[PDB]
């Protein structure tokens, strides 16, 4: 029952990568640089 160690490890690695990707989607305070 439950995850095998391989499945668990792959889930942790994918989770770390996905959380990094979601963090990178955040906008810095100047991102909408509107031209004049």
């Amino acid at each position: 029952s439950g995850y095998t160690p391989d499945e668990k490890l792959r889930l942790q690695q994918l989770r770390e990568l996905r959380r990094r990707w979601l963090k990178d989607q955040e906008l810095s305070p100047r991102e909408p640089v509107l031209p004049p």
């Binding site: 989607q25 955040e26 906008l27 991102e31």
Partner: protein
Amino acid sequence: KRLFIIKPSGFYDRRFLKLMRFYILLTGIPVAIGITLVNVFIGEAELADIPEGYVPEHWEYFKHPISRW
């Protein structure tokens, strides 16, 4: 927090719409102004009887100035 929203490129559709509007208006605003000026200052002809012995020109059988022209 404010997040980036992934969308397709909206630049090209907007550019096309602006170009089409520009050209249509560029030729159609003078046409509308000319139509209004003609209507205001050169009205429509008034129907009248043919005077005796007179042979009207063919364009004289219509009433709107643009149609007559």
